[PDB]
Design a protein around this ligand. Structure first.
Ligand SMILES: OCc1ccc(NC[C@@]2(Cc3cccc(C(F)(F)F)c3)CCN(Cc3c[nH]c4ccccc34)C2)cc1N(O)O
Ligand SMILES: Nc1ncnc2c1ncn2[C@@H]1O[C@H](COP(=O)(O)O)[C@@H](OP(=O)(O)O)[C@H]1O
Length: 241
């Protein structure tokens, strides 16, 4: 069952955290990679779960628990905006918030997750997405999960100023909302020490804190997917996946 709730937004180090939690607990962690490289069936389940935000709350909470059964932690979209509900469902779970410089975050988001509608790189991302078998339902899940995390009904995804404001507002509100001894804010570069002390575990012996999922590596993955049109053919070059 869930031991750690991760509230950090995509492109803040969530895959490195997922890897780190799996090293610490020796059990699997949710992350969107789980959805795309393992379980594309859960897309609609998240999308429908998102529209839901008393017998309404019990129905939502049971569907969250079923989606997360078998995992010890959640990172990344679409679980982000549910961090408060997860605190209620799992009262002993600790909460992590991965953060970084807002401009670095926005660039990383634009290059990997949510390119502008007139960015030429969007064309490549979409071509690689088809090689992975991702359809418009996945795109709507990404957009709706971000809107849900930001608590916005209407969001112009092409507006960087609004995304930067939403980023700062989201990170501030997590730090206001999570009881303070229940929260650890992790900045990129912090390493094992703050995470292991917060979780009260020993630092893993002789291994660096994970450094995975860079935009440089995602750009290479997209380029290789577009070139050969086969994930099986290229997976050997991307051992993290
Ligand atoms: O939770 C991490 C996360 C969750 C979901 C997604 N979906 C983003 C993508 C789809 C998309 C959505 C909206 C607009 C567009 C656009 F604009 F291109 F049309 C594309 C763009 C790239 N595609 C492959 C992929 C990259 N990473 C992934 C992680 C997991 C699963 C797949 C991917 C998915 C990305 C990430 N990140 O952070 O990578
Ligand atoms: N240990 C680490 N040190 C520095 N940056 C790290 C890191 N682990 C992950 N990152 C950065 O976190 C981002 C990935 O976050 P996520 O896994 O949530 O999608 C990437 O930013 P860049 O796109 O700027 O390279 C990646 O380089």
């Amino acid at each position: 069952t869930i031991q750690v709730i991760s509230a950090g937004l995509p492109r803040t180090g969530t895959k490195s955290l997922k890897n780190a939690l799996e090293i610490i607990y020796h059990k699997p962690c949710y992350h969107m990679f789980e959805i795309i490289f393992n379980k594309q069936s859960d897309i609609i389940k998240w999308q429908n779960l998102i529209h839901d935000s008393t017998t309404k709350t019990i129905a939502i909470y049971d569907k969250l628990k079923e989606l997360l059964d078998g995992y010890i932690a959640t990172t990344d979209l679409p679980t982000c905006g549910f961090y408060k509900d997860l605190m209620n469902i799992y009262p002993n779970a600790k909460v992590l918030l991965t953060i970084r410089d807002k401009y670095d975050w926005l660039h990383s988001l634009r290059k990997v997750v949510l390119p502008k509608s007139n960015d030429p790189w969007k064309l490549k991302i979409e071509e690689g997405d088809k090689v992975l078998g991702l359809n418009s339902d996945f795109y709507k899940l990404t957009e709706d999960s971000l809107k849900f995390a930001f608590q916005k009904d209407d969001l112009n995804f092409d507006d960087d100023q609004v995304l930067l404001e939403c980023y700062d507002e989201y990170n501030r509100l997590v730090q206001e909302t999570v009881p303070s001894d229940r929260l650890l804010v992790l900045r990129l570069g912090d390493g094992w020490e703050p995470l292991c002390k917060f979780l009260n575990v020993e630092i893993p012996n002789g291994i660096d804190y994970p450094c995975v999922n860079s935009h440089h590596q995602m750009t290479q993955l997209t380029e290789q997917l577009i070139k050969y049109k086969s994930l099986d053919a290229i997976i050997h070059m991307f051992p993290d996946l």
